[PDB]
C-alpha cells in the first residue's frame, strides 16, 4: 500500500551519479553518448540535488491504504484525497508533515494484525463462537459430557478452515457458514436440539444433521463410544465422507475414460 503509492507516483540520486559518473555495469558508455543538452541537464542534478515536496506522495500512501481495508470506497478516493491534502496543506508543519510519515510507515507495517485477522479468522469466527459458546446452556448437560468434545471440535473447525467460516449473529440465533458462498448455512442456535441426545444409545432435523456432516471430518475418537446416535452418526458421516471421496475420484476416472451413467452405479 506504499509501493503502490511509489508505483503511482515519483517516476533517485545514487542511480543518477552512478550513471553520469559511468559506474554502472551493463552499459557504462550510456550517459556519455547522449546529446550535450541532456549531459548538462543531468550533471547539475548530482552536483546540487533539487529539493522535493513529498506530502502528496505519502498522502497518496494513506488513501491507498484506507481504500484497501475498506473505509473510503474505491470511487471516493478523489474527494478523500483532496480533503486530506487540503487539511494537511493547512495545518501543515514539521508537526503534521511528520505525523504523516509515521502513519504511512506504520500502516504498511502494522498490517500483521490484519493478516492475523484472516489467518485465524479471529474477527468473526472465534470471537463470535467464543461468544456463542458463552450463550450456550451451562457446560453441564444432564445426559453426557461428550458435549465438550463436540463443542471443541466446533472451535477447531472454525479455527482450521479460514476460508470464510463466518459466524454471524443474524439476530437471536448465531448461524455457522461453511463458506462465503454460504450454501451450507446451518443454524447454531438450533442445535439446542442436540441438548437432547447428548447422551443416549429421527428427532434430528437435518439442520442438526447439517452441523454433524459439517464437523464430522474433524472428529476422530472424540465424540465417542456408542454414545448413541451422536456417536455413531458422527462415525457414519465420516465413513460417508470417505466413501464420497472414493466415489468422487471414481466418477472423475469413469468420465475421463469416456449421460447419467456413472451417477447411477455410484449413488
Amino acid at each position: 500500500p506504499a509501493m503502490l503509492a511509489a508505483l503511482q507516483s515519483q517516476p533517485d540520486w545514487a542511480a543518477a551519479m552512478d550513471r553520469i559518473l559511468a559506474l554502472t555495469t551493463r552499459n557504462p558508455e550510456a550517459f556519455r553518448q547522449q546529446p550535450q543538452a541532456n549531459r548538462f541537464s543531468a550533471i547539475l542534478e548530482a552536483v546540487v540535488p533539487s529539493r522535493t515536496n513529498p506530502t502528496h506522495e505519502k498522502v497518496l500512501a494513506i488513501v491507498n491504504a484506507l481504500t484497501e481495508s475498506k473505509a473510503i470506497r474505491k470511487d471516493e478516493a478523489g474527494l478523500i484525497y483532496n480533503a486530506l491534502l487540503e487539511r494537511v496543506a493547512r495545518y501543515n508543519s514539521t508537526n503534521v508533515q511528520a505525523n504523516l510519515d509515521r502513519l504511512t510507515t506504520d500502516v504498511r507495517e502494522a498490517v500483521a494484525q490484519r493478516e492475523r485477522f484472516m489467518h485465524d479468522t479471529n474477527l468473526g469466527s472465534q470471537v463470535a463462537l467464543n461468544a456463542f459458546l458463552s450463550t450456550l446452556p451451562a457446560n453441564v448437560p444432564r445426559g453426557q459430557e461428550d458435549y465438550v468434545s463436540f463443542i471443541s471440535a466446533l472451535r477447531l473447525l472454525v479455527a482450521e478452515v479460514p476460508q470464510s467460516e463466518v459466524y454471524q449473529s443474524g439476530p437471536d440465533y448465531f448461524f455457522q457458514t461453511s463458506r462465503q458462498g454460504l450454501q451450507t448455512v446451518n443454524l447454531t442456535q438450533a442445535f439446542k436440539n442436540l441438548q437432547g441426545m447428548w447422551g443416549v444409545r429421527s428427532l434430528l432435523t437435518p439442520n442438526t444433521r447439517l452441523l454433524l456432516l459439517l464437523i464430522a471430518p474433524f472428529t476422530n475418537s472424540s465424540t465417542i463410544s456408542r454414545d448413541s446416535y451422536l456417536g455413531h452418526l458422527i462415525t457414519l458421516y465420516r465413513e460417508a465422507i470417505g466413501q464420497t471421496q472414493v466415489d468422487e475420484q471414481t466418477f472423475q476416472e469413469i468420465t475421463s475414460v469416456s449421460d447419467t451413467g456413472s451417477l447411477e452405479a455410484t449413488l
Partner: peptide, 26 residues
C-alpha cells in the same frame, strides 16, 4: 522492376529522449 534495397535491422532514435520530425512544432 526490382527493389530489394538494404538497411533494416529496425531504427534508432535512441531514448533517454525521443524521436525526430517534431511531432508538432513548425
Amino acid at each position: 522492376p526490382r527493389h530489394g534495397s538494404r538497411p533494416f535491422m529496425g531504427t534508432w532514435n535512441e531514448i533517454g529522449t525521443s524521436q525526430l520530425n517534431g511531432g508538432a512544432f513548425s
